[PDB]
Amino acid sequence: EKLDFKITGGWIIDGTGAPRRRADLGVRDGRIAAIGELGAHPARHAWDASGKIVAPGFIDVHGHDDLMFVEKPDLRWKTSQGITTVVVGNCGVSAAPAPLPGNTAAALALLGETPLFADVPAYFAALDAQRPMINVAALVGHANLRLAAMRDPQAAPTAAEQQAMQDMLQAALEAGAVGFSTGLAYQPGAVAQAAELEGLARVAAERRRLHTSHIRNEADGVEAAVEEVLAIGRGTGCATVVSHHKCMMPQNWGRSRATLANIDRAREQGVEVALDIYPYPGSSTILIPERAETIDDIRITWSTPHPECSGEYLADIAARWGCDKTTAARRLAPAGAIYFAMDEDEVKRIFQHPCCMVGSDGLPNDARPHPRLWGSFTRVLGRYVREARLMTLEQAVARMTALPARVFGFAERGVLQPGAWADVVVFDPDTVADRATWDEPTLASVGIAGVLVNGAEVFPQPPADGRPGQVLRA
Ligand SMILES: CP(=O)(O)N[C@H](CCC(=O)O)C(=O)O
Ligand SMILES: [Zn+2]
Numbered sequence: 413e414k415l416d417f418k419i420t421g422g423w424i425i426d427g428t429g430a431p432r433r434r435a436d437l438g439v440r441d442g443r444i445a446a447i448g449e450l451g452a453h454p455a456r457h458a459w460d461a462s463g464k465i466v467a468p469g470f471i472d473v474h475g476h477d478d479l480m481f482v483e484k485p486d487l488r489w490k491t492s493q494g495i496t497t498v499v500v501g502n503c504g505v506s507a508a509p510a511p512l513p514g515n516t517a518a519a520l521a522l523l524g525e526t527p528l529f530a531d532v533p534a535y536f537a538a539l540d541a542q543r544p545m546i547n548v549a550a551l552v553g554h555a556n557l558r559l560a561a562m563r564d565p566q567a568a569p570t571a572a573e574q575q576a577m578q579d580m581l582q583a584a585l586e587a588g589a590v591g592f593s594t595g596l597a598y599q600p601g602a603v604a605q606a607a608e609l610e611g612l613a614r615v616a617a618e619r620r621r622l623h624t625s626h627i628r629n630e631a632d633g634v635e636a637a638v639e640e641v642l643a644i645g646r647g648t649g650c651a652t653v654v655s656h657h658k659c660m661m662p663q664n665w666g667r668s669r670a671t672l673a674n675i676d677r678a679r680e681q682g683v684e685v686a687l688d689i690y691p692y693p694g695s696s697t698i699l700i701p702e703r704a705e706t707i708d709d710i711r712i713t714w715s716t717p718h719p720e721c722s723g724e725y726l727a728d729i730a731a732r733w734g735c736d737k738t739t740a741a742r743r744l745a746p747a748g749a750i751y752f753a754m755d756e757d758e759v760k761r762i763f764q765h766p767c768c769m770v771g772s773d774g775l776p777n778d779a780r781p782h783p784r785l786w787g788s789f790t791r792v793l794g795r796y797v798r799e800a801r802l803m804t805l806e807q808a809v810a811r812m813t814a815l816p817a818r819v820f821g822f823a824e825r826g827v828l829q830p831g832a833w834a835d836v837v838v839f840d841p842d843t844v845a846d847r848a849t850w851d852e853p854t855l856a857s858v859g860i861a862g863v864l865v866n867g868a869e870v871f872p873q874p875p876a877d878g879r880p881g882q883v884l885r886a
């Protein structure tokens with residue numbers, strides 16, 4: 413039978429870590445039909461990958477694009493960097509379930525202004541009706557759970573409220589969620605104690621689902637914070653992921669030696685533990701006034717009362733207004749910012765850990781976003797692999813494909829093998845690179861030649877109508 417698509421003349425890096433090999437790839441009915449010599453095989457569509465690498469589409473394990481499938485459906489910031497699948501609902505905040513009327517959280521604003529969904533089934537129904545550009549897997553946020561179950565989300569939960577959150581989690585998992593996420597460094601999640609988190613972890617563990625976590629503190633208390641979530645995994649057996657692992661502030665640079673060692677002790681004991689990073693020494697989230705006097709070069713990404721301040725340094729704003737930086741930050745609220753507080757050499761060492769995946773952590777709603785939104789994966793390929801030689805291209809591709817699929821349980825994805833879904837990316841290994849900078853954070857990558865999602869082209873030319881992305885129901 414005629415192939416729907418064929419990619420010939422290139423070198424395949426299938427995600428297994430095996431050395432690249434010269435071979436063609438054929439696609440039929442959304443899946444990889446064959447791999448080998450297809451030069452003379454008839455195909456409806458054909459791509460010449462001569463001089464390029466043909467690999468599995470990249471899986472962004474740390475997305476916050478929950479509401480973008482309806483707000484900004486193009487998802488060009490993903491496809492332009494080779495991403496074919498994204499895991500949303502991270503750091504305790506997700507599209508569903510909806511908070512109780514009146515209950516809110518600063519971190520939720522980062523997802524966008526679209527009213528949140530009632531529950532996971534409602535969210536997935538919306539995605540089924542308006543198919544996403546790329547595949548979407550979803551985690552349920554602990555913040556959402558607390559905001560949906562507690563009339564006072566700043567209190568300790570009653571036995572009934574704890575059970576309510578567990579029941580909501582169970583429902584979400586039955587609906588297809590891949591697990592739940594926590595944002596322990598943010599309200600209301602920070603209020604949670606071990607019993608509350610372990611209770612939710614037991615529900616996920618029972619169904620072989622995940623607990624991805626933005627730990628309690630990533631600065632002075634980073635080691636204890638890692639220990640806290642590892643203790644949960646150890647005691648419940650729940651597969652765990654340490655989100656955007658890092659060490660903030662000069663006095664904490666180098667502590668990854670200790671945190672990674674603890675992570676190793678945990679996985680040696682049988683607990684499934686992984687982590688992810690974005691390739692930059694600056695973080696980005698809501699503007700936190702308490703940081704105004706401890707971190708220099710805080711750059712505003714957005715501000716509701718002062719939208720003219722996006723892209724400006726807090727110090728320059730405060731100087732102009734004639735007030736101290738803390739006062740200026742309070743006047744900018746609600747707002748978001750970028751914090752340059754990590755050691756890039758350490759970021760690289762963390763990425764080298766065998767269980768580290770790539771998570772862009774892009775904030776698509778930001779007026780002047782952190783460039784990781786558009787350049788994370790290509791920065792890894794161009795700067796971490798080609799420029800720094802932190803690992804081979806074959807190893808890096810595995811971290812972006814097969815590893816994520818294994819950690820999140822995505823059957824028939826993350827690898828180029830017959831029968832698997834045809835999520836494919838074709839790129840030039842010598843030119844692939846990010847172009848997004850701190851000043852111009854939305855510049856598209858170079859070196860990405862084409863991207864297929866379930867066998868359909870999404871890059872460089874997006875589909876005219878219905879998009880190829882699928883909801884990855886666990
Ligand atoms: C929305 P988020 O929780 O994924 N952003 C974190 C903030 C880390 C920090 O500065 O506390 C980051 O950029 O790593
Ligand atoms: Zn986070």
Ligand SMILES: [Zn+2]
Pocket residue numbers: 474476502503626773
């Ligand atoms: Zn996040």
